[PDB]
Design a protein around this ligand. Sequence first.
Ligand SMILES: [Mn+2]
Ligand SMILES: [Mn+2]
Lengths: 151, 128
Amino acid sequence: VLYKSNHNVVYSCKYHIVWCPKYRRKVLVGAVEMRLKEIIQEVAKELRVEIIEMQTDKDHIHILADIDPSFGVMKFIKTAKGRSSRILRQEFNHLKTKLPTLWTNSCFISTVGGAPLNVVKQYIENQQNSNRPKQKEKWKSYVDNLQTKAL
Amino acid sequence: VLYKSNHNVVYSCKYHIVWCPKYRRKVLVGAVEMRLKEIIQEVAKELRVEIIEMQTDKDHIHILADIDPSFGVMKFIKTAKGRSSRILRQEFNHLKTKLPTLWTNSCFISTVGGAPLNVVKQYIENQQ
DNA sequence: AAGCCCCTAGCTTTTAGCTATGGGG
DNA sequence: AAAGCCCCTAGCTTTTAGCTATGGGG
Ligand SMILES: [Mn+2]
Ligand SMILES: [Mn+2]
């Protein structure tokens, strides 16, 4: 796991973001799909967001991004959907005439880290004495990174 | 993990947040430690933030919290650090006299989810 | 725990189109 | 060191304070 920092925060903020076109119309196909990803990449590039992975289904776009926690994941999302909708609808007439808006007013957001929730929770508990979790091997690299970043 | 939602978003945003007192003074102990944790819960309640786990070292406070993406993790943090600084320094003389500020301008924030990163990166790759 | 419909101001994409711990049905 | 120390604006809470901002300088 690699950490970045703005002027005041050290962070690692990865989000699995998903959103679908309006009425889940299966429009994210062909040139629309390829164009959409290109627009998202340029939006991320200028908004200093790192697209770790991004794939499209026919009525879904999955994005795994690292976003500055102070910038705001929603600021990235609003920009990506807003611009892509404005552009795509200009380029592909069918999205303009057969749909009131390209996207919906919602999305799905889930945080992603280097280890599953339970181990981080475990590590937090241990702090009160910091003896040794003894685990085995499992998740030792992650926990090692942490204790180092905190001393 | 059980997803929540506001009016327009289904989410699960858990962060591991860590911050320290000014100059890393091992001051988070006894009455102070207890009062700080109290203030944090008080603030989280007020700000609809779920504190999944919170423990203090002596120059660190760890918090695992689920925060609304639209609300903002920083909004939770500034309130938590700011109010706790105000109150603690009001309730503990040694904290106001020996330090210019209780906290620092920085903090550590690490996102956490049900699965590790590579697992989620693979799952996404399989969407083709 | 959204996804449909409708609405508003804010802000971008501005003769658009998506947010807001938005609000209502 | 920079996140952490120093210093500053500016926005908002905690406002006879004290922490933010994809902030910015040593
Ligand atoms: Mn600074
Ligand atoms: Mn899918």
